[PDB]
Amino acid sequence: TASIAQARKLVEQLKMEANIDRIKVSKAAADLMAYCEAHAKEDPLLTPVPASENPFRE
Amino acid sequence: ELDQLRQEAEQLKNQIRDARKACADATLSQITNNIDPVGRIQMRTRRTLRGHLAKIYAMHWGTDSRLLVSASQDGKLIIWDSYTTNKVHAIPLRSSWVMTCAYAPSGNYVACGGLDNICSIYNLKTREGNVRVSRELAGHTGYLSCCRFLDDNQIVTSSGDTTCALWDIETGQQTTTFTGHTGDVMSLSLAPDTRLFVSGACDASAKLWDVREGMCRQTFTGHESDINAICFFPNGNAFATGSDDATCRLFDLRADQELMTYSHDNIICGITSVSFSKSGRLLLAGYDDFNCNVWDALKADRAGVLAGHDNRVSCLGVTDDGMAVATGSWDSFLKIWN
Amino acid sequence: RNEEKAQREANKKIEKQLQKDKQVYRATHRLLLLGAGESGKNTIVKQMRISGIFETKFQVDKVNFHMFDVGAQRDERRKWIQCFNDVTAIIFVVASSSYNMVIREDNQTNRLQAALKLFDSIWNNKWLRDTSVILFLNKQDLLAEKVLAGKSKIEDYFPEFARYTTPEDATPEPGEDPRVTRAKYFIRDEFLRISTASGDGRHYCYPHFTCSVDTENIRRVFNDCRDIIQRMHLRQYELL
Amino acid sequence: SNDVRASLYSLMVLIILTTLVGNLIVIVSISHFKQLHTPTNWLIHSMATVDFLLGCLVMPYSMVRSAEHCWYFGEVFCKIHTSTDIMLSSASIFHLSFISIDRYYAVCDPLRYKAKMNILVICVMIFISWSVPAVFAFGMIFLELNFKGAEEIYYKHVHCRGGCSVFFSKISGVLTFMTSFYIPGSIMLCVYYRIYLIAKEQARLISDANQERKAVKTLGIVMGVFLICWCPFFICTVMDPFLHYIIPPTLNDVLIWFGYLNSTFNPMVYAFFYPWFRKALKMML
Ligand SMILES: CCc1[nH]nc(C(=O)Nc2ccc([C@H]3CNCCO3)cc2)c1C
C-alpha cells in the first residue's frame, strides 16, 4: 500500500543516513576555534576600527 | 508488513542514536571557558531608513554591499542605496502579501514571494528605464516563505506545501523538487560552495539537501518549537538555527551532532532572525523584545544589547565583509547599526 | 555634482509617488473573509460583484472595501494568521443548514460542531484580539424547508433543542412559519455562547440571518464596520 | 503687611514653576516618539508650546506688578506685554476648540476619520490658530483700537491699577466677548454633548447585551476646568463697562490669575489624563 511504500522509503533513507562517515566533535570544535582566532585579526564591527575610515561618517 | 517496517525503522533509529552517542565523547565548554572573553561590546545606530507603509517583512543585501531591497506588507518592493540613504527603485506588486526578498549576485534580478504562491522575477536593467516582471513562477500550492538565487538562471524556492523546489528561470519548470519534512518550511540558506543548502520546518527538524543528487543528505533535530530563522556559517562547516522557544542553536555538518546552544533566563519571546559576522566571532539575533540581543559565538555570553526598535524584529542582515548590520522591524524602519 | 543631483531628483520623485500610494492605502478598509467549505462564499462575493488567494474590491457608499478571500495558505496551519492582525473585521461565514450530519472534513466532526471548534479557535487566538468577528449565517431558507417537514430534526445529533424555548428577542417581522424561529435562534445562541468566554471589551460579535442570495449582504457589512470603529474610538478617550 | 506679599510671591513662584515643568515635559515627550506622531498629537504639542511661551515670557513680568501694586518700567514694554498676553491666551482657546472639533470627527464619523483629518488640514488648523489671534492682538493694541475713546476713563483706570493695564470699551468689549468666548464655548458644549449622548447609548447597548460613568466624569473634568477658569473673567469684563466701571482692582488681578491657572492646568487634562501618554512617560523612566 501507500503506507507500506512510504515506510519502506523512510527505512531506506535511514539506512542511507546510517552509511555516513563519523567525524569526532573535538576535531570540528578545534577547526572552528582555529578559524575564529585566525580571522579575529581583521574582525570589523568588533575591533576598535578608526572613525575616519567608516564611510557612514556619523 | 507494516509492523515489520515499523520495527526495522525503530531498530535503525536505535542504531543511529547509539552511534551518535558513541561519537559524542567531547565538548567545547571547558576549552571555550579557557579562552579570553571578548569583553564589553556596544554599538550605536548610524543611519535610519524609512518610507515604508506597513510592517517590513524581509530584507536582503547586494554583493556591492551598498544597495539593498525591502518588502512591505503594503505590496512595495523598494531598492535602497544605504551609503547615501536614498531610494533608487520602487516596484509595486500584484499580491499585497509578500514575505520574501532576494537580490541577484549579477545585480540585475530581484525576486519576491508570499501567499500568492507565485515567485516573480524582475529585470532591473532593461532597454526601457522602468523595471518589469521578467517571469512568474507557478506550481507551489502553499505560501512562499523565502527565495534565493543560486545563479543568474537558477533559483531555489521554499513553500508552505512542506516541499521545496529548484527552478530554471529560462524554461520555467519545477525541476529538482526536494520532498520531505512533515510541517511547513519557513527558512532557507545557501552555501558559498553552491552545492548544498539547509531548510527548516515547523516540526523542529532541519534537512541538509545536496542540489546535484536531488535528494535528502543530512538531518538535524533538537528544538522544541517551529524553526523561525536559519543562517549558515561563513566557513561552511556550521549553521545557526533560531526557534520560538527563546533558544538559538549552532550545529556542525561534519560532526552531525547537536552542538552547543544558548540560553538566558531573562527572555521568553521567540527569535525571528539570526545572522553571523565576517569572522564569526559574534552572532546577532532579533527577538520580540524589540531589540537585537547579540551573543558571543564561543562563550555563549550576552556581550552587548542593541535597542532602538519599538516592535517585533522580523529581519536582520550582515553584509558580506562584516562591515555593518541592518535591522528591520514591524515598525517599518530599517536601521543600520555599527 | 550632476550625478548626485540626478540621484536626489530620482529619490524625490520616488517619495512623491509613494505619498499618493500612502493616501490611497490609508483611505480604504481591509476585511478578512474566512469561511467554511460547505458555506457558500462564492455566492456572496458574486453578489458584491454586481493564484490561490483572491481579492474582491467594492465600495458600499463611499468607503473602499477589500475582501481577502484566502484560498492559498496551508489549511492546517496558523503561521499565515499573524499576517492579519491589522484588519478591521473578519467576515466569518457559516451557513445555517447542516444537510443531515455532514462533516466539514474527514477527521472533523459534524458541521454544527466543526464550525463551533473553528469559531472557538479563531476567537481565543492571541494574535487576533483586537478584531471584531462578524458571523454571517447563510442557507437559511434551505434550513426553513429542511426542518419544516420534521424528518431531519435537530435532535439527530443535538440532545438539546427539546428543552429549548424561544427568547423574547425573537422578532420575525414578516411572520413566516414561526416554528423555524426556535431553531434559528438556537443555532444563533450556541454561536453567541462562545463569544462571552474571552469577551473583555476588546472584540465583539455580530450575528446575522441571510437567506440564499440578497443584495443586503453588502449594506450590513458597512453598518457593522461603522459600529466597530466607534467603540474603538471610545476606549481611547475614556468615554466608553 | 510683608507676610501677605511673601505669600503671594511664593504662590506665584509655585504656579510659574508648575506650568513651566508641565509644559516642558509634554513638549519633550511628544517631540520625539515615533509611536505617537498622530496629527492630534501635533495639536497637543502646539498647545504645550504656546502655554510654555506664555509661562516663560509673560507671567513673571505681571508677577511683580500685582505684587507691589506698581510698575517698574514703562515706556513701550508694557505695550508688547499687553499685546502678547492677548495673543497667547487666544491661541490657547482656539487650540482647545480645534481639539474638540477633531474629537467630534473622531467619534461621530468613525470610518471617514483618516480621509479627512490628515496632516494637511491639521497644519491649516495650527496656522489659523497661530495667525488670526496674533494679527488682531498686535493691531488693536498698537493702532490704539482697544478703547477708541473714553480717554479720561482709560487714563484714570490705568493709573489706578498700577501704571499699565488691559482696558476695554463698550463696543470693543462686546466684540471681544462675542468673538472669543461665544463660538469656542458653544462649539465645545455642543460637540461634547453629542459625544455624551452617543457614548450613553453605546454603553446602554453593551450593558443590556452582555448582562456612562466614565463619559460623565471625563466631560465633567474638561468642561469644569474650562468654564471655572475662563467664564468669570469674561463675564465680569463684559458686564463691567455697562456698570460705570465700579470694580476694585483685586478682582481684576484674581480674574487674570484664573486665566493663568487655566494655562497651568491645560496640559494635565489633555495629556496627563490618558493611559497611553502616561505609559510612554513611564516607559522613558
Ligand atoms: C482672535 C479673535 C479675538 N479678538 N479679540 C480677542 C480677545 O480680546 N481675546 C482675549 C483673550 C484673553 C484675554 C485676557 C487673557 N489674560 C488676561 C488678560 O487678557 C483678553 C482678550 C480674540 C481672541
Short mmCIF file of N, CA and C in Angstrom, two decimals, chain D residues 41-97:
data_model
loop_
_atom_site.label_atom_id
_atom_site.label_comp_id
_atom_site.label_asym_id
_atom_site.label_seq_id
_atom_site.Cartn_x
_atom_site.Cartn_y
_atom_site.Cartn_z
N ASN D 41 -1.89 64.68 18.06
CA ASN D 41 -0.78 64.87 18.98
C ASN D 41 0.06 66.09 18.60
N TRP D 42 0.10 66.43 17.31
CA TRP D 42 0.70 67.70 16.92
C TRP D 42 -0.10 68.88 17.46
N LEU D 43 -1.43 68.76 17.48
CA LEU D 43 -2.24 69.82 18.09
C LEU D 43 -1.96 69.94 19.59
N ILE D 44 -1.81 68.81 20.28
CA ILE D 44 -1.46 68.85 21.70
C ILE D 44 -0.09 69.49 21.89
N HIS D 45 0.86 69.18 21.00
CA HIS D 45 2.19 69.77 21.08
C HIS D 45 2.14 71.29 20.89
N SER D 46 1.31 71.76 19.96
CA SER D 46 1.15 73.20 19.78
C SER D 46 0.54 73.86 21.02
N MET D 47 -0.47 73.22 21.62
CA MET D 47 -0.98 73.69 22.91
C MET D 47 0.14 73.85 23.92
N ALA D 48 0.95 72.80 24.08
CA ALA D 48 2.00 72.83 25.08
C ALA D 48 3.02 73.93 24.80
N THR D 49 3.36 74.13 23.52
CA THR D 49 4.33 75.16 23.16
C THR D 49 3.80 76.55 23.47
N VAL D 50 2.56 76.84 23.09
CA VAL D 50 2.03 78.19 23.35
C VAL D 50 1.87 78.42 24.85
N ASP D 51 1.49 77.39 25.60
CA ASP D 51 1.43 77.54 27.05
C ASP D 51 2.82 77.77 27.64
N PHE D 52 3.85 77.12 27.09
CA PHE D 52 5.20 77.32 27.60
C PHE D 52 5.68 78.75 27.35
N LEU D 53 5.43 79.28 26.15
CA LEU D 53 5.80 80.67 25.89
C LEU D 53 5.06 81.62 26.82
N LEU D 54 3.76 81.39 27.03
CA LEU D 54 3.01 82.21 27.97
C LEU D 54 3.63 82.15 29.36
N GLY D 55 4.00 80.95 29.80
CA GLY D 55 4.56 80.79 31.14
C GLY D 55 5.94 81.39 31.29
N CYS D 56 6.70 81.47 30.20
CA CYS D 56 8.07 81.96 30.31
C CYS D 56 8.14 83.48 30.18
N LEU D 57 7.55 84.05 29.14
CA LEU D 57 7.83 85.45 28.82
C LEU D 57 6.68 86.41 29.11
N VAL D 58 5.61 85.97 29.78
CA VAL D 58 4.52 86.87 30.13
C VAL D 58 4.27 86.86 31.63
N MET D 59 4.22 85.66 32.22
CA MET D 59 3.90 85.53 33.64
C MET D 59 4.82 86.32 34.56
N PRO D 60 6.16 86.22 34.47
CA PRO D 60 6.99 86.83 35.51
C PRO D 60 6.91 88.35 35.58
N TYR D 61 6.62 89.02 34.47
CA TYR D 61 6.57 90.48 34.50
C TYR D 61 5.30 91.00 35.14
N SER D 62 4.18 90.29 35.00
CA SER D 62 2.98 90.62 35.75
C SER D 62 2.99 90.01 37.14
N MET D 63 3.98 89.18 37.46
CA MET D 63 4.09 88.61 38.80
C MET D 63 4.35 89.70 39.83
N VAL D 64 5.24 90.64 39.52
CA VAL D 64 5.59 91.68 40.48
C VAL D 64 4.68 92.90 40.36
N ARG D 65 4.10 93.15 39.18
CA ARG D 65 3.24 94.31 39.01
C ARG D 65 2.06 94.27 39.97
N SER D 66 1.42 93.11 40.10
CA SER D 66 0.35 92.95 41.07
C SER D 66 0.87 92.78 42.49
N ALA D 67 2.14 92.39 42.65
CA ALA D 67 2.68 92.16 43.99
C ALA D 67 2.87 93.47 44.74
N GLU D 68 3.46 94.47 44.09
CA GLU D 68 3.75 95.75 44.71
C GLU D 68 2.73 96.83 44.36
N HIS D 69 1.71 96.50 43.57
CA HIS D 69 0.69 97.44 43.12
C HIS D 69 1.28 98.60 42.33
N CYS D 70 2.44 98.39 41.70
CA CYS D 70 3.11 99.46 40.97
C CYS D 70 3.90 98.87 39.82
N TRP D 71 4.24 99.74 38.87
CA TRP D 71 5.00 99.39 37.68
C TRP D 71 6.43 99.93 37.79
N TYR D 72 7.39 99.06 37.48
CA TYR D 72 8.81 99.43 37.48
C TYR D 72 9.19 100.24 36.25
N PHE D 73 9.00 99.67 35.07
CA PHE D 73 9.49 100.26 33.83
C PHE D 73 8.34 100.41 32.85
N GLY D 74 8.13 101.63 32.38
CA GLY D 74 7.04 101.90 31.46
C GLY D 74 7.48 101.93 30.01
N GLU D 75 7.49 103.13 29.43
CA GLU D 75 7.87 103.34 28.04
C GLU D 75 6.97 102.54 27.10
N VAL D 76 7.53 101.53 26.45
CA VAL D 76 6.82 100.77 25.43
C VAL D 76 6.78 99.28 25.71
N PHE D 77 7.45 98.81 26.76
CA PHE D 77 7.49 97.37 27.01
C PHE D 77 6.11 96.84 27.40
N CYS D 78 5.39 97.56 28.26
CA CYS D 78 4.07 97.09 28.66
C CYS D 78 3.11 97.02 27.48
N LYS D 79 3.38 97.79 26.42
CA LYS D 79 2.57 97.69 25.21
C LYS D 79 2.69 96.29 24.60
N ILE D 80 3.92 95.82 24.39
CA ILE D 80 4.11 94.48 23.86
C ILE D 80 3.68 93.43 24.87
N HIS D 81 3.75 93.75 26.17
CA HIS D 81 3.27 92.81 27.18
C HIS D 81 1.77 92.56 27.04
N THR D 82 0.98 93.64 27.00
CA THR D 82 -0.46 93.51 26.88
C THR D 82 -0.88 93.06 25.49
N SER D 83 0.01 93.17 24.49
CA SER D 83 -0.31 92.61 23.18
C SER D 83 0.12 91.15 23.04
N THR D 84 1.01 90.67 23.91
CA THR D 84 1.43 89.27 23.89
C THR D 84 0.51 88.39 24.73
N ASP D 85 0.05 88.90 25.87
CA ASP D 85 -0.85 88.12 26.70
C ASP D 85 -2.13 87.76 25.95
N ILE D 86 -2.69 88.74 25.23
CA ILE D 86 -3.89 88.51 24.42
C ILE D 86 -3.64 87.43 23.39
N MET D 87 -2.53 87.54 22.65
CA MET D 87 -2.23 86.58 21.60
C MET D 87 -2.13 85.17 22.15
N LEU D 88 -1.43 85.02 23.28
CA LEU D 88 -1.17 83.67 23.78
C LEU D 88 -2.44 83.04 24.37
N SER D 89 -3.22 83.80 25.14
CA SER D 89 -4.47 83.24 25.67
C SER D 89 -5.44 82.89 24.55
N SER D 90 -5.55 83.76 23.53
CA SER D 90 -6.43 83.48 22.40
C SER D 90 -5.97 82.24 21.63
N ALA D 91 -4.66 82.08 21.44
CA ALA D 91 -4.17 80.89 20.77
C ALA D 91 -4.53 79.64 21.55
N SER D 92 -4.41 79.69 22.88
CA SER D 92 -4.79 78.54 23.69
C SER D 92 -6.27 78.20 23.52
N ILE D 93 -7.14 79.22 23.55
CA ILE D 93 -8.58 78.97 23.40
C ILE D 93 -8.87 78.34 22.04
N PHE D 94 -8.29 78.90 20.98
CA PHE D 94 -8.55 78.38 19.64
C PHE D 94 -8.07 76.95 19.51
N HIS D 95 -6.93 76.63 20.13
CA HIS D 95 -6.44 75.26 20.09
C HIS D 95 -7.40 74.30 20.79
N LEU D 96 -7.97 74.73 21.92
CA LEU D 96 -8.96 73.89 22.60
C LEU D 96 -10.18 73.63 21.72
N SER D 97 -10.68 74.67 21.06
CA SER D 97 -11.83 74.50 20.18
C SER D 97 -11.52 73.53 19.04
#
